């Protein structure tokens, strides 16, 4: 049921690219699902600060 290896529970990705504009902000992430894992997208969200 649970892995006996070193491995993270929560990963934080900073944008690889961004485009702040007159009325919108756009950001790109490299969502790297590492090997021998699966990600449920329901556990993903954008942590915005401003």
């Amino acid at each position: 049921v649970t892995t006996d290896r070193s491995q993270r529970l929560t990963l934080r990705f900073v944008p690889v690219d961004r485009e702040d504009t007159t009325y919108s902000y756009k950001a790109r992430f490299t969502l790297a699902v590492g090997d021998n894992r699966v990600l449920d997208m329901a556990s993903t969200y954008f942590d915005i600060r401003g």
Binding site: V14, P15, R18, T22, Y23
Partner: protein, 59 residues
């Protein structure tokens, strides 16, 4: 009937970018949240040593 007849005889389109300058970016961000605590820590340390005058003058 003749002479000239030889030839022939909106609302909102909502643009956005207009006449402003170009824009650029960088990723070396955000020490700044620490000073908000530096400032309010050192502010306490002022009052703390004003008290240390008073608590020695009262002796």
């Amino acid at each position: 009937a003749a002479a000239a007849m030889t030839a022939t005889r909106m609302p909102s389109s909502g643009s956005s970018p207009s006449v402003p300058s170009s824009i650029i970016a960088e990723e070396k961000l955000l020490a700044l949240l620490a000073e908000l605590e530096a400032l309010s820590r050192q502010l306490a340390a002022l009052t703390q040593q004003v008290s240390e005058l008073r608590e020695q003058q009262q002796q």
